[PDB]
Ligand SMILES: *[C@@H]1O[C@H](CO)[C@@H](O)[C@H](O)[C@H]1NC(C)=O
Ligand SMILES: *[C@@H]1O[C@H](CO)[C@@H](O)[C@H](O)[C@H]1NC(C)=O
């Protein structure tokens with residue numbers, strides 16, 4: 292049985308068929324760029340304080356002093372969850388006394404925001420935080436919302452992989468793409484916080500599923516030369532485009548419902564891909580469905596205007612796979628044997644440590660000095676050079692050395708955050724941007740590495756499993772802001788240390804550079820051990 296690459300060598304690397312698949316699978320990823328980090332604006336927290344109803348016709352002086360002031364970052368600003376006792380203030384106002392001149396504010400009774408909160412309109416007109424007052428006693432629900440979204444991503448990564456490796460890749464791709472769009476649509480008409488969180492979980496669950504499905508399907512369809520280009524300058528750059536345009540929508544649309552409408556609509560256009568994206572012939576050949584693979588190959592050859600040979604498969608090849616048409620694979624196969632088990636463990640460690648840093652930096656943009664939209668754009672913008680560098684490294688360098696260098700750069704850049712002077716914010720900003728650049732390059736490369744390592748029989752399952760354990764860090768990523776209380780530089784120290792320690796581990800992975808994609812568990816590379 293000749294390798295799939297040799298069987299379809301006559302189609303050529305570039306042509307109408309490959310070009311169409313390349314750009315339609317790349318286009319599918321823009322909605323993922325929109326959705327992945329939308330929580331930055333949908334779950335923003337505008338400045339707030341207790342509302343004092345206008346019914347209480349307090350004196351002007353008292354309406355200057357209805358709320359205690361506090362040292363929030365040394366800025367003398369109103370307290371966000373307390374007010375002076377309204378009845379007492381009204382009584383003093385009626386009696387004629389005024390703050391300071393007659394009543395000492397230090398002795399005034401304080402009470403919670405009984406009449407709600409007034410959110411500032413300077414940045415956001417409305418978000419879910421303002422919609423359901425996820426502030427003060429309920430401030431923990433926002434990071435909980437993001438954590439649940441990443442939990443949905445975890446579940447999607449786990450399930451979609453097995454579903455795809457069982458019932459093909461096109462079906463799962465389209466089903467979960469429709470899931471993402473549909474459950475994004477319902478969120479607009481959300482009426483309760485609980486329904487919103489459920490829908491958000493489902494949205495993430497479809498989002499990651501269809502991202503991975505498109506990535507794997509394109510990796511299998513396209514040839515060796517264009518595989519790396521598709522992986523790096525394709526899916527990842529189109530993701531970067533979506534992520535860069537997200538803040539553009541946010542800038543002109545300050546309402547979370549309208550913003551969600553804008554973000555969801557462009558994903559609807561993906562329906563047109565059904566009549567053009569075919570099932571992976573590699574996967575079909577693996578499952579033993581030779582007729583469908585042959586039909587797809589003949590269609591592709593006709594598209595490119597290439598005369599098909601007399602027979603795609605030598606009869607001997609057809610009889611060879613008769614025995615392999617019977618067996619089946621499941622999750623337990625990734626741990627049945629020693630070699631695949633070790634590969635899986637190392638891949639899980641790589642993915643977890645990379646994603647920790649990636650989503651730690653990505654979600655931290657709001658806290659950075661300067662305009663939120665500009666910071667978000669810069670965070671998205673810096674990715675494109677990262678993917679170009681990833682492309683170059685995968686093309687011209689061994690996987691191990693390139694991954695080690697990328698991780699080492701990302702870790703070392705962050706680890707030095709403590710040395711920045713206090714007043715030089717821009718130095719910290721560029722350090723964070725360079726760390727993001729390195730971690731993004733590493734994340735782009737790890738996808739290709741994992742895809743190459745696993746065989747086609749369990750390729751999607753393997754990538755999904757690796758992505759599943761990856762989201763543990765993302766789940767706790769929103770809570771890094773809490774850790775900042777202990778020390779501002781501590782989270783950067785931890786991310787850098789984790790990345791540096793990872794970089795060493797990468798040297799033990801098998802070298803897959805310049806190696807054809809395996810098709811069976813007995814063809815994958817052997818770890819340097821048993
Ligand atoms: C009361 O607050 C207004 C703004 O709402 C401010 O311009 C004014 O100076 C304040 N008055 C006093 C007496 O502090
Ligand atoms: C209003 O303030 C005056 C002056 O301190 C006090 O004597 C009176 O009891 C207060 N009334 C209420 C209802 O708190």
Ligand SMILES: *[C@@H]1O[C@H](CO)[C@@H](O)[C@H](O)[C@H]1NC(C)=O
Pocket residue numbers: 348384385
């Ligand atoms: C507030 O308005 C009410 C009528 O709504 C009036 O009786 C009362 O005297 C006003 N209070 C003050 C302090 O002027």
Ligand SMILES: C[N+](C)(C)C[C@H](O)CC(=O)O
Pocket residue numbers: 327499502527530734735758
């Ligand atoms: C960052 N990038 C584009 C490499 C990956 C996507 O966010 C998908 C994922 O979360 O794995």
Ligand code: NA
Pocket residue numbers: 319320321322323468501502505
């Ligand atoms: Na997509």
